[PDB]
């Protein structure tokens, strides 16, 4: 297979304005949302049809309870952080946990915490330690690292349990997560715009080459964007030189297939 990733996000906001929730939790396999929970619904609900189809009510009832607890725990350590920083008003607190299953068979695990959208605490499962970006984080770190049973737990979960979940979901959503839709590539003029659309997965490689050598460097890349139908689109541009004749060609790579469009 390709590189597949499972990643779960949690957001905590201190003074949510108006109808904004104070706690949100969403799960992703690759680029697809699979499960969601907010402080208003207080339920864990499917966000993909193949998730609702394959997981018994037991699952949703069990994880609903757990997320209610996490809503509490996050509201409490957002308070302790905000006191240590001496920060008034609004601040955010985020958490990302997850796996990656690489094509070659290797894996990666990661668990991170964030404050105001900045790195705050990063876990290293290979050294069983927490990296702190400041001294507020350093204070939290010293307590966490004193409980090595907890650290050993996280290492085991990231390396075995998360990966196991991912394989489980990859099969649930096989018809979606493991399909290939090749890109449609064309070349426009204004600078040559190499434009691709209608492809999945969204991982795509585009570049311009002059006379057989890569432009190193002033290619202008466009972001990979969702089309709204499950496919994606992107582009790359280079300005054409009016002094010299040059063979410009756009190179696209996608799911193991290389493509060349010459001009």
């Amino acid at each position, epitope marked *: 297979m390709r590189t597949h990733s499972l990643r779960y996000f949690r957001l905590g906001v201190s003074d949510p304005i108006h109808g904004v929730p104070e706690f949100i939790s969403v799960g992703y396999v690759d680029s697809h949302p699979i499960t969601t929970y907010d402080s208003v619904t207080r339920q864990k609900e499917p966000r993909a049809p193949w998730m609702a189809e394959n997981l018994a009510p037991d699952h949703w009832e069990r*994880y609903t*309870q757990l997320l*209610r607890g996490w809503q*509490q725990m996050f509201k409490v350590e957002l308070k302790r952080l905000q006191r240590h920083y001496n920060h008034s008003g609004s601040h955010t607190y985020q958490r990302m946990i997850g796996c990656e299953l690489l094509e070659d068979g290797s894996t990666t695990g990661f668990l991170q915490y964030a404050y105001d959208g900045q790195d705050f605490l990063i876990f290293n499962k290979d050294t069983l330690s927490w990296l702190a970006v400041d001294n507020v984080a350093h204070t939290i770190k010293q307590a966490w690292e004193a409980n090595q*049973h*907890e650290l050993l737990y996280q290492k085991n*979960w990231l390396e075995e349990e998360c990966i196991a979940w991912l394989k489980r979901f990859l099969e649930y959503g096989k018809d979606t997560l493991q399909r290939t839709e090749p890109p449609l590539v064309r070349v426009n003029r204004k600078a040559l715009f190499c434009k691709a659309h209608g492809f999945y997965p969204p991982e795509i490689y585009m570049t311009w080459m002059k006379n057989g050598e890569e432009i190193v460097q002033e290619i202008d890349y466009g972001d990979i964007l969702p089309s709204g139908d499950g496919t994606y689109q992107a582009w790359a541009s280079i300005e054409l030189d009016p002094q010299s004749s040059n063979l410009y060609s756009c190179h696209v790579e996608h799911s193991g297939v290389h493509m060349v469009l010459q001009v």
Partner: antibody
Amino acid sequence: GQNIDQPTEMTATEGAIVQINCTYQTSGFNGLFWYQQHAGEAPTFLSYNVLDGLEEKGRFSSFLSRSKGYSYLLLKELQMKDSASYLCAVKDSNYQLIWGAGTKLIIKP
Amino acid sequence: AGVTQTPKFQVLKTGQSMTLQCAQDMNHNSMYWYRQDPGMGLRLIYYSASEGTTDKGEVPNGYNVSRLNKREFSLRLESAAPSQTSVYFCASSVWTGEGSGELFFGEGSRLTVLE
């Protein structure tokens, strides 16, 4: 699964060494706990294993093999006060505890 | 201190109402009610992940619970039955979900139900 197996009763001599086995067949693995329960009393935490290897705490040690799906609690230099029931408990994929039926340790003086 | 549970003993007729009390002063979020029976491992009746929610365990039938606050988690026998004869243990932990956190048990309560 899900299933945890533990011998019903074990007998060993004072001063000797005893090894209480715990084999588990669960849906995922998030850690294995050992508990000590004296007759008439409440269970109290003994040890916790989640990664392969042997962890020592005094006269007691706990070993874990994730691949083989088993753990043992080792008690060295047995004393009469070690006479109790020992409970094995595994946390599954959904962080729920499965409890073994416990093992009653009888110590011959 | 620790985990406090009452009563330690109780005799009940069929089928009588009964409420078991449990309190913890360790500022724990998750609390539990277990029943212990000869020949089998502990069985969860009900649990409470945190101060504002509870849920069924493995053997919820014939029971109900109330997480009154962060400290108190009460078990309730609706109508006593001979099969409910058991030792009941209250327990609490820092967090029921992710973690290496262990359980802290209460002294236990022996209920005997007779005709």
